[PDB]
Enzyme design. Sequence first.
Site, short mmCIF file in Angstrom:
data_model
loop_
_atom_site.label_atom_id
_atom_site.label_comp_id
_atom_site.label_asym_id
_atom_site.label_seq_id
_atom_site.Cartn_x
_atom_site.Cartn_y
_atom_site.Cartn_z
N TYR A 198 0.82 -1.21 0.00
CA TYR A 198 0.00 0.00 0.00
C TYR A 198 0.86 1.28 0.00
O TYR A 198 0.35 2.37 0.25
CB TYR A 198 -0.97 -0.02 1.18
CG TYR A 198 -1.98 -1.12 1.05
CD1 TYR A 198 -3.12 -0.93 0.27
CD2 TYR A 198 -1.77 -2.37 1.60
CE1 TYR A 198 -4.03 -1.95 0.07
CE2 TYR A 198 -2.67 -3.41 1.39
CZ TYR A 198 -3.83 -3.18 0.66
OH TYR A 198 -4.70 -4.20 0.38
N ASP A 228 2.91 -8.43 -4.04
CA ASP A 228 2.90 -8.42 -5.50
C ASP A 228 3.87 -7.35 -6.04
O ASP A 228 3.79 -6.18 -5.65
CB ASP A 228 1.46 -8.19 -5.95
CG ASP A 228 1.19 -8.27 -7.44
OD1 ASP A 228 2.08 -8.73 -8.17
OD2 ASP A 228 0.14 -7.76 -7.85
N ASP A 334 -3.61 -14.89 -2.31
CA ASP A 334 -4.58 -13.95 -2.83
C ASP A 334 -5.36 -14.55 -4.00
O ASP A 334 -4.96 -15.55 -4.61
CB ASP A 334 -3.88 -12.66 -3.23
CG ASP A 334 -4.71 -11.38 -3.22
OD1 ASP A 334 -5.96 -11.46 -3.05
OD2 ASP A 334 -4.10 -10.30 -3.40
N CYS A 375 -6.70 -14.14 1.20
CA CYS A 375 -7.31 -12.91 0.70
C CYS A 375 -7.95 -13.16 -0.65
O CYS A 375 -7.64 -14.10 -1.35
CB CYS A 375 -6.37 -11.70 0.69
SG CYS A 375 -4.70 -11.98 0.03
N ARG A 390 -8.25 -11.77 5.20
CA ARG A 390 -8.72 -10.44 4.81
C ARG A 390 -10.25 -10.52 4.69
O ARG A 390 -10.78 -11.40 3.99
CB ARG A 390 -8.06 -9.97 3.52
CG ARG A 390 -6.64 -9.44 3.71
CD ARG A 390 -6.59 -7.97 4.08
NE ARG A 390 -7.39 -7.13 3.20
CZ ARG A 390 -7.14 -6.94 1.91
NH1 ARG A 390 -5.93 -7.18 1.42
NH2 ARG A 390 -8.13 -6.54 1.11
N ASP A 394 -9.74 -3.88 -0.34
CA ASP A 394 -8.45 -3.27 -0.04
C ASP A 394 -8.67 -1.90 0.60
O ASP A 394 -9.53 -1.11 0.16
CB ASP A 394 -7.62 -3.10 -1.31
CG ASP A 394 -6.97 -4.39 -1.81
OD1 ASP A 394 -7.30 -5.46 -1.27
OD2 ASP A 394 -6.20 -4.31 -2.83
C1 LIG Z 1 -4.54 -9.00 -3.54
C2 LIG Z 1 -3.86 -8.17 -4.51
C3 LIG Z 1 -2.87 -7.29 -4.14
C4 LIG Z 1 -2.02 -6.69 -5.14
O1 LIG Z 1 -2.17 -7.29 -6.49
C5 LIG Z 1 -2.70 -7.00 -2.77
O2 LIG Z 1 -1.84 -7.90 -2.10
C6 LIG Z 1 -4.09 -7.01 -2.03
O3 LIG Z 1 -3.87 -6.61 -0.63
C7 LIG Z 1 -4.67 -8.39 -2.10
F1 LIG Z 1 -6.08 -8.32 -1.64
#
Ligand SMILES: *[C@@H]1C=C(CO)[C@H](O)[C@H](O)[C@H]1F
Length: 532
Positions: A198, A228, A334, A375, A390, A394
């Site tokens: 973030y 990512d 994710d 997530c 999660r 986001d």
């Molecule tokens: C899934 C996707 C991302 C970035 O592509 C992040 O890691 C996010 O917090 C996750 F929900």
Amino acid sequence: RGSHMASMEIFGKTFREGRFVLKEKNFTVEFAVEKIHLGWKISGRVKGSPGRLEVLRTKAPEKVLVNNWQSWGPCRVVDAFSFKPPEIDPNWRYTASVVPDVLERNLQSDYFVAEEGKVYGFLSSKIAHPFFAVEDGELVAYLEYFDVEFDDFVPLEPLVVLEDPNTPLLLEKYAELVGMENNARVPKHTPTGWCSWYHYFLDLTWEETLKNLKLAKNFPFEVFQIDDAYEKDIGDWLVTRGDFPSVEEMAKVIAENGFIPGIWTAPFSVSETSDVFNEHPDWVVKENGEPKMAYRNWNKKIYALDLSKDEVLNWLFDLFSSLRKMGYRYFKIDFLFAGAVPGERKKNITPIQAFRKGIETIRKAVGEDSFILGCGSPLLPAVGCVDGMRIGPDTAPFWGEHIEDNGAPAARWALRNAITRYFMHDRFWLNDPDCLILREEKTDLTQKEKELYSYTCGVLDNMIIESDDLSLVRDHGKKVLKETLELLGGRPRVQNIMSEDLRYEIVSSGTLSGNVKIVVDLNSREYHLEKE
Ligand SMILES: *[C@@H]1C=C(CO)[C@H](O)[C@H](O)[C@H]1F
Ligand SMILES: [Mg+2]
Ligand SMILES: [Mg+2]
Ligand SMILES: [Mg+2]
């Protein structure tokens, strides 16, 4: 003896305690209706071809708390009567619904639905997808078996119907029963740490990582988690890009610096460009014999691994085993919904059955000593496998004051879901409310918003992970984190869970700061905290 309860139908017949048999052309259900504390439980077994199996029918309340099946989707109060079908984003169809035929006609809720004084909730999603639809003024509970046939009986996903004026209490009791049914993992210790996403998003460099790894020694972070950015493509988890070292080398640098190495994958996803997909085109879920797009992200079609295939599960096992060998002990996994998309698989099993095989393989590979954070994930199917989950869209370095409530990034809507799914915390798993963004610069969050978000998460006892260029976190950011961690350790309750004006009264008993209450208003972006 209630007039509402006389108005209920279970498997098409009138609601009462007993053991029952429904025989139809295509399937047979044997079920029991039992009295339990605070209501009723319906359990049993089914065989044949149940398809979309109607379980319960009752008159639809005017105001319902509805729940999307996955992390990012809304959990919120809506008017059941004035619903109009949403426009569904063709790139994200299955985040909205695993049964989009429903949602393009009717109000849908996945797993559970609540009204003032009542909870209807399925205790599991192991085989069927359990959902509710409002169909011409009736609330209907369904178990979707996705056209799978069972020669022998399999267990129904149990349904509870709980009634009591204290709706928060009901949601907490429901979640207790889910956790029991699925052998939920609720770690006694919650990790703190740092996440790259973030601040740096896809532009993270190893150079910037190393800067933050040095600064992180001054912060109360146990985990240091690469998000990512590092990977050459989606599915090619062990191939890095740019200025990154090897995935093994990253772990060793992180460990050498005294942190638990964390890494991000999207393990059920392979992009149309990836090596893995191009090497193994028959590893994916299909439609009309051809790869079926699970979603579109990173400007690519993304396909879903077919988790009914032994070759795929072995690959997952080998991957996560490798990562554990390197020293990773924190896994953010994710876009898990991809594994559960409807479509054609090698074995004629449900997408939920496939999903569960996949996540169970990952758990086995990383071992009991690794933390798994889910997530973009179906919620019920993951209970018993993940350590944290999660539970909101986001967050973002802005509030989102006129951002729509559609599961897209925004601090305002991330925090809303942390509040409305609070009851899952320390019952299903540890709730992850997403990262605190406490930097003083390169943010559109106000100091009061940072406080509101952080202190709410602390009161809710939720996971606390920070995601900032640590260079840009000074006195104010450090103080907010310090005060946040002082609010952990309690048993929270959102006292007005059916609120429609985004103002919530939240108590938490037995925190490190004693009994606490925070009143929050997500419209006005105000809070009022009392610590006693
Ligand atoms: C899934 C996707 C991302 C970035 O592509 C992040 O890691 C996010 O917090 C996750 F929900
Ligand atoms: Mg009727
Ligand atoms: Mg078969
Ligand atoms: Mg706790």
